[PDB]
């Protein structure tokens, strides 16, 4: 870390791409709750049987387990035991969000948030 470089050379300093989370104009609404697992930014979240936030996990069970019904979108990342701020309302670009496996197409990603204040849709 000490010396300069006297010799010529090139360097690709880096690249930046915007992440657009909002895809519409509902009332954006947020809440905070304890996490039960490692949650990434804009990961879709559910609440487990103990009321702690857990990343959304459809087909968790033979009766479906409460992790299987999504409840919000993480606004900042958190480790287990920490508080997670998360969105409960708003219109969100499905592409930016973190999704479970097998929840591939937008047609499925909408089905997670029909009965809800959140709605999830495509950007143009």
């Amino acid at each position: 870390t000490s010396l300069p470089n006297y010799l010529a050379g090139n360097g690709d300093l880096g690249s930046w791409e915007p992440t657009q989370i909002f895809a519409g104009e509902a009332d954006i609404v947020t809440e905070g709750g304890a996490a039960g697992a490692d949650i990434e930014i804009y990961q879709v979240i559910a609440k487990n049987a103990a009321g702690a936030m857990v990343p959304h996990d459809p087909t968790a069970t033979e009766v479906p387990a409460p992790q299987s019904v999504a409840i919000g979108i993480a606004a900042q990342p958190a480790k287990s035991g920490q508080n997670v701020p998360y969105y409960i309302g708003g219109v969100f670009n499905h592409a930016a969000l973190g999704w479970h496996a097998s929840l591939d197409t937008l047609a499925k990603r909408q089905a997670v948030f029909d009965r809800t204040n959140i709605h999830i849709g495509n950007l143009y």
């Binding site: 010529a8 050379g9 690709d12």
Partner: peptide
Amino acid sequence: GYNTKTFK
């Protein structure tokens, strides 16, 4: 987005 290049 943007992309960047640098030279000595």
